[PDB]
């Protein structure tokens, strides 16, 4: 009866981050809804919110690249976007001269928050084109009531 959600990124839509439920090892149970690529909790309580985003890249671009992963909350109590969790990474330090060696960078967010009914949680990134869709379990989002 515990509201639980564990959604995985869609491997068929390159260039955007879309969450799915009707896949193996993915859950949407006990009231949690998936609307507008966002998770809506069914009750007020303490939720563990977690997410993991894997960025891939063929070589290092000439310009510097920053990868930002942010779990944000739009609640009925504030009605604005509030960043619950945030992380920034800089995968490349110098331009590739030669063979473009691939780079991989994982970013994990995890916390416990008190959420009211109707709050919408969104896991957003700044560079959707760098997303990893090769194998399952690399990019995912989730909230579990506690």
């Amino acid at each position: 009866d515990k509201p639980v959600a564990h959604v995985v990124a869609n491997p068929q839509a390159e260039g955007q981050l879309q969450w799915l439920n009707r896949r193996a090892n993915a859950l949407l149970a006990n009231g949690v809804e998936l609307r507008d690529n966002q998770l809506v909790v069914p009750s007020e309580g303490l939720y563990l919110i977690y997410s993991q985003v894997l960025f891939k890249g063929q070589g290092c671009p000439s310009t510097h690249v920053l990868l930002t992963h942010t779990i944000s909350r739009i609640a009925v109590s504030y009605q604005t976007k509030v960043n619950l969790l945030s992380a920034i990474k800089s995968p490349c330090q110098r331009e590739t001269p030669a063979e473009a060696k691939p780079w991989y960078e994982p970013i994990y967010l995890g916390g416990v928050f008190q959420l009211e009914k109707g709050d919408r949680l969104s896991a957003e990134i700044n560079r959707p084109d760098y997303l990893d869709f090769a194998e399952s379990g690399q990019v995912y989002f989730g909230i579990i009531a506690l």
Binding site: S62, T63, L66, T68, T70, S77, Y78, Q79, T80, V82, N83, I88, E124, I125, N126
Partner: protein, 141 residues
């Protein structure tokens, strides 16, 4: 379904009371129907930028020194800290809330098609014998 500007009481869900305005946070609930809500002003380093009934104020942001950002506006009780760039600089947005200040690209062997905006670099159009590359005019040969 109470009208706009009012929130339902967490206990005894039949009486609704007005939300606290900007710069104030909820300290106590409504002591009965029709009374005013206990809204207290946010302390230093905390703010609320919209109508809310939150138990505490949001932590106001700080300008990033490594991004070249400067503090246009201070951290008030109702407005978030405003960070920007100095003169002849433009902000490049890595994400929704993250940006870096870069010096505006001066035209070399070219003309300014569009001036340096707040969130856009200077647009430079080259002439014969030069072409654009990374917003810089360089010789073809």
């Amino acid at each position: 379904v109470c009208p706009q500007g009012k929130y339902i009481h967490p206990q005894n869900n039949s009486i609704c009371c007005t939300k606290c305005h900007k710069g104030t946070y909820l300290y106590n609930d409504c002591p009965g129907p029709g009374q005013d809500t206990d809204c207290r002003e946010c302390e230093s380093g905390s703010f609320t930028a919209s109508e809310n009934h939150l138990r505490h104020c949001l932590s106001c942001s700080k300008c990033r020194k490594e991004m070249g950002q400067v503090e246009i506006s201070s951290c008030t009780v109702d407005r978030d800290t405003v960070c920007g760039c100095r003169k002849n600089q433009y902000r490049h947005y890595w994400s929704e809330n993250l940006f870096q200040c870069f010096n505006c690209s001066l035209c070399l062997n070219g003309t300014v098609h569009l001036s340096c905006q707040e969130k856009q670099n200077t647009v430079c159009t080259c002439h014969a014998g030069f072409f654009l590359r990374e917003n810089e005019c360089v010789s073809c040969s």
